[PDB]
Amino acid sequence: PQITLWKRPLVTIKIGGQLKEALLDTGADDTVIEEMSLPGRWKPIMIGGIGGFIKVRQYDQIIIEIAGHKAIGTVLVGPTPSNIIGRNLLTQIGATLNF
Amino acid sequence: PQITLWKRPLVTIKIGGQLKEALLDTGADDTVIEEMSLPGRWKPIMIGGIGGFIKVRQYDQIIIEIAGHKAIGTVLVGPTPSNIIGRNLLTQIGATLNF
Ligand SMILES: CCCC[C@H](NC(=O)[C@H](C)NC(=O)[C@H](CCC(=O)O)NC(=O)[C@H](Cc1ccccc1)NC[C@H](CC(C)C)NC(=O)[C@@H](NC(=O)[C@@H](N)CCCNC(N)=[NH2+])C(C)C)C(N)=O
């Protein structure tokens, strides 16, 4: 599909057995999901953006479906203002920017 | 062009007649440039990012060239981690996400 940018590019994702809406973010290196109780081990890390840093839990090899496209990779979980799909997963679903 | 996302989608911009590098950011509503002298009038506002809110200067109707495509619109100037081209100008250059 093709997504125009008149409004925020939000799509449905499936992660941890839950459906969520998430923002496709070419300006995000990483994928950040709003606080949810994902199982298993994780690593504390801090991520940066506008406004400063926040503390997140880094989970590896998490299964995630993005607009119907399966992906698997590192997902960061914590108090983000939006679920964000970043380049680490956008590359796996073959997303490009075009103009 | 078509831009893949294995690296940050950085392009050349011209603003105030000066060349800069900026990130194409589909997760940004607005366009935010590092502190610079810029011709035109401005007003102070607040914008939020992943880590919190910052003060920026809002300039309207600013000419900006992005990867050799013309845009004219609102540019926010302030202490951002990166120059960012957001949806307000990505729509002007006809950018879409594709997968
Ligand atoms: C796995 C190792 C991680 C290492 C870690 N990496 C990072 O921190 C990397 C560089 N950060 C980033 O890439 C982060 C996303 C988080 C992430 O991917 O990790 N990107 C970002 O935060 C980029 C800007 C940026 C680019 C490059 C560098 C820094 C910053 N913007 C993304 C962000 C998405 C939004 C949901 C918060 N957009 C914005 O912040 C834009 N804001 C807006 O559009 C506002 N109008 C919305 C207000 C909020 N309101 C609300 N929810 N009601 C702003 C740029 C105008 C590190 N460096 O410590």
Side-chain angles (χ1 to χ4, degrees):
Chain A
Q2 182 169 94
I3 305 178
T4 61
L5 294 173
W6 301 114
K7 56 178 192 179
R8 293 177 174 164
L10 293 175
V11 299
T12 300
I13 67 164
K14 182 161 68 51
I15 182 181
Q18 302 198 303
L19 294 190
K20 300 175 196 295
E21 297 298 298
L23 183 66
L24 304 182
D25 193 349
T26 56
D29 299 341
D30 309 302
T31 290
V32 67
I33 302 301
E34 68 206 353
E35 175 63 44
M36 59 176 300
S37 297
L38 226 38
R41 299 180 61 213
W42 55 273
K43 187 178 180 182
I45 76 169
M46 286 171 60
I47 59 183
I50 269 170
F53 289 72
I54 64 164
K55 292 168 181 90
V56 294
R57 302 189 303 281
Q58 175 179 275
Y59 291 87
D60 296 322
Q61 297 287 120
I62 298 308
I63 301 163
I64 178 166
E65 198 175 77
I66 300 154
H69 286 67
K70 304 190 188 287
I72 177 161
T74 298
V75 171
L76 310 177
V77 173
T80 173
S82 181
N83 294 321
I84 290 167
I85 307 301
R87 292 187 301 99
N88 70 309
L89 297 181
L90 294 170
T91 52
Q92 299 183 21
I93 68 172
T96 54
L97 280 165
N98 303 70
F99 58 96
Chain B
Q2 170 161 267
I3 303 170
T4 61
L5 292 168
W6 303 100
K7 84 165 293 308
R8 291 177 168 163
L10 301 169
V11 303
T12 52
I13 66 169
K14 180 166 65 72
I15 181 173
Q18 184 180 59
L19 298 184
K20 292 181 172 294
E21 196 176 67
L23 182 69
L24 306 179
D25 190 352
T26 57
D29 299 342
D30 311 303
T31 291
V32 193
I33 301 302
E34 294 157 6
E35 292 181 346
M36 69 180 291
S37 296
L38 181 61
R41 171 128 221 185
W42 58 271
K43 65 187 222 146
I45 67 160
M46 305 294 288
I47 62 171
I50 190 134
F53 287 76
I54 62 167
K55 312 188 174 104
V56 296
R57 297 173 168 196
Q58 175 177 342
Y59 294 78
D60 298 321
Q61 308 198 313
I62 298 295
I63 298 173
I64 172 174
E65 194 90 357
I66 302 156
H69 297 66
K70 139 129 308 112
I72 309 176
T74 294
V75 174
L76 312 182
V77 178
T80 175
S82 182
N83 295 330
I84 295 163
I85 309 301
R87 292 188 297 98
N88 72 308
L89 305 180
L90 294 168
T91 49
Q92 288 203 15
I93 70 178
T96 62
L97 282 165
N98 294 272
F99 59 102

